[PDB]
C-alpha cells in the first residue's frame, strides 16, 4: 500500500 | 465525555504519555476530551490529534482488508459478520473524527495552517470511509475530494511547496486519486508536480525544516516509484 | 456474557480470523465467549485462549514498563494515574483469566495434558499480577509458584521431557524464579536440567515433534545466555 | 526481558 501521513 | 472531568493540560500529557507506551486507543481517546473542551488546538496538540487516530483506524483498516481478503477467497455468515463488526467500528472512529472536525474545530479554524491541517484530515476521514463503502459510496468520496481540494487551494495560497502540511496534504490527495477515485494519471501528476516544486524551494529551508520537507518528499518519491 | 447468543462453533471460527487479522482483544472476547459454554477445551482451543490473552496482556505489561520508568525518572499526579489506569486494567486482565481457570476449567480437567496447561495459565497470571503488586505481592508470587509447581508435579509423571507444554511451563517457571521470585540459581538449574532432559529425547521424535520441542528448547538456550 | 511463551 502507498505512503500516507 | 468520559473525559469531561480531567483537565485539558493533564489530558494533552496522558496523551503524550500514551504514545510513548503505544497505546493509541488512549491517546485516541484523551485528544478527543482535549478538543471537546472547547480551545483551539496548537500546532503539537493537532499533530497530537491526527496521529492517535491515524494509529486507531490504521489498525481497523489492517484488520478489515485481511478479513476482505478471507470473505471474498470464501466466495457460514461468520467471516462476513466478523468483517462487518470491524467494518462498524472502523466507520464509527471515522464518524467520531468526523464529529470533531465539524464540532467545532475547522469554523474556528482561522489560521490557514490550521484550516489546511483540518480539512486535509476531513479528507482522511472520507477517504477510510470510502474504502469500506458500497454504493452512498459515491457521495462519500466526492466529500473527500472536496475536503482534500479546498485544504490544497488554501494550502497553495497560504503555505510554501516545503512546508510539511502542505507536503503530506497533497501526499494523501495522491493516493486519494490513485486508490479511491480511481484515477492514477491525476496521482502521479499531484504526486510529480508537488514533489518537484518542494525540490525546488528546499534552498530556501533551514537544518530542521529541510529535514522535515525532504522526509515527506520521499514518501512521494517512493509512491511513485510503486505507480510508475 | 454479551457472547452468550453466539454459537460455541462460531466463536472459535472468530477467534481464529481475529488472529489472523492481529485483533487479540477481540479474539481473547471470543475465546472468554468459548470457554463460558462450558463444555471443555481442545488442545486447540486451549491454544487460541492463550495466544489471545498473552497478546492482550503483553501489550499491557509493556506499555506499564514504558509508563513506571517514566513514573520512576519523575521522582503532577498524571503520570502515576496513567500507570495506575492500565495497571488496573492489567489486573483485570488477569483476573478475567484466573476466573476462567477457576469457573471452571482447572476442576473439569481430567487429562495431565489439560491440567498442565491450565495450571501454567494460573502461573502465568499470578506472575503477571505479581510484576505490578507492591505488598500481597507475597501471596500472589507464593500463589504463583504452587501453581507452577503443581504443573510441574504432573508434567514429570505424564508427559515426556520433550512435551512443549511441559517444556513452555519450565521455561516460564525459570523466568518466575529469575524475575519474581529473585531466586536467578533456580532459574538457571531449572532452564539447564529442562533443556538437557529434552536433548537426550529428541531421538525419540518425529520431525514434526521435533520442531515443535526445538523451538523452546532455543528460548530455554536464549534466557541462559542472557542469565549467564 | 527473557523469553516465555
Ligand atoms: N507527538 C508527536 N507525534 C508529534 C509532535 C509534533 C510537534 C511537537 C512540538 C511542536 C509542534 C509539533 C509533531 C510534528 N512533528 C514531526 O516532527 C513529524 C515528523 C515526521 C513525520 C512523519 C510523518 N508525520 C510526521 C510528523 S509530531
Ligand atoms: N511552518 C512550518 N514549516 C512548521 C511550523 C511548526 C511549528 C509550529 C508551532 C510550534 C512549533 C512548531 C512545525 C512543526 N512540525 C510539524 O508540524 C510537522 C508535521 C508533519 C510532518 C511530517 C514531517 N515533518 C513534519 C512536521 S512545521
Ligand atoms: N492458532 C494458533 N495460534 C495455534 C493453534 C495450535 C493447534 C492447532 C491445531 C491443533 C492443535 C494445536 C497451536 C499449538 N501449535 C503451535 O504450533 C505453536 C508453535 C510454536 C509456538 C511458539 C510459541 N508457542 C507456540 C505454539 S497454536
Ligand atoms: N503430545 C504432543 N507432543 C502434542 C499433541 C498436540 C495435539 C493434540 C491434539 C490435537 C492436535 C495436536 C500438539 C499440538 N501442538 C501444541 O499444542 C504446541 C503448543 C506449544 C508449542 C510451542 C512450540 N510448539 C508447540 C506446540 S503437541
Ligand atoms: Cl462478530
Ligand atoms: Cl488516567
Ligand atoms: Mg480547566
Ligand atoms: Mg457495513
Ligand atoms: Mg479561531
Ligand atoms: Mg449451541
Ligand atoms: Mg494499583
Ligand atoms: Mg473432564
Request: contains cysteine.
Given at each position: ?5 | ?11 494533552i ?6 504514545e ?35 494509529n ?76 469500506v463503502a ?16 479546498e ?7 497560504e ?38 516544486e ?7 529551508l ?16 517512493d ?6
Amino acid at each position: 500500500f502507498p505512503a500516507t501521513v | 465525555g468520559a473525559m469531561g472531568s480531567m483537565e485539558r493540560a493533564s489530558l494533552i500529557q496522558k496523551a503524550k504519555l500514551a504514545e510513548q507506551a503505544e497505546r493509541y486507543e488512549d491517546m485516541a481517546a484523551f485528544m478527543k476530551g482535549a478538543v471537546e473542551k472547547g480551545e483551539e488546538l496548537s500546532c503539537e496538540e493537532r499533530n497530537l490529534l491526527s496521529v492517535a487516530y491515524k494509529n486507531v483506524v490504521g489498525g481497523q483498516r489492517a484488520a478489515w482488508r485481511v478479513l476482505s481478503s478471507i470473505e471474498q477467497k470464501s466466495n457460514g455468515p461468520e467471516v462476513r459478520e466478523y468483517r462487518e463488526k470491524v467494518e462498524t467500528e472502523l466507520q464509527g472512529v471515522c464518524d467520531t473524527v468526523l464529529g470533531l472536525l465539524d464540532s467545532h474545530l475547522i469554523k474556528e479554524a482561522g489560521d490557514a495552517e490550521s484550516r489546511v491541517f483540518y480539512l486535509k484530515m476531513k479528507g482522511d476521514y472520507y477517504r477510510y470511509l470510502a474504502e469500506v463503502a458500497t454504493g452512498d459510496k459515491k457521495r462519500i468520496i466526492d466529500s473527500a475530494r472536496s475536503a482534500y481540494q479546498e485544504a490544497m487551494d488554501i494550502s497553495k495560497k497560504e503555505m510554501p511547496p516545503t512546508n510539511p502540511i502542505r507536503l503530506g496534504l497533497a501526499l494523501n490527495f495522491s493516493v486519494f486519486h490513485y486508490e479511491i477515485a480511481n484515477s492514477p494519471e491525476e496521482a502521479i501528476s499531484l504526486a510529480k508536480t508537488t514533489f518537484d516544486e518542494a525540490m525546488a524551494d528546499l534552498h530556501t529551508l533551514s537544518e530542521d525544516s529541510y529535514k522535515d520537507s525532504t522526509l515527506i518528499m520521499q514518501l512521494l518519491r517512493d509512491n511513485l516509484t510503486l505507480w510508475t
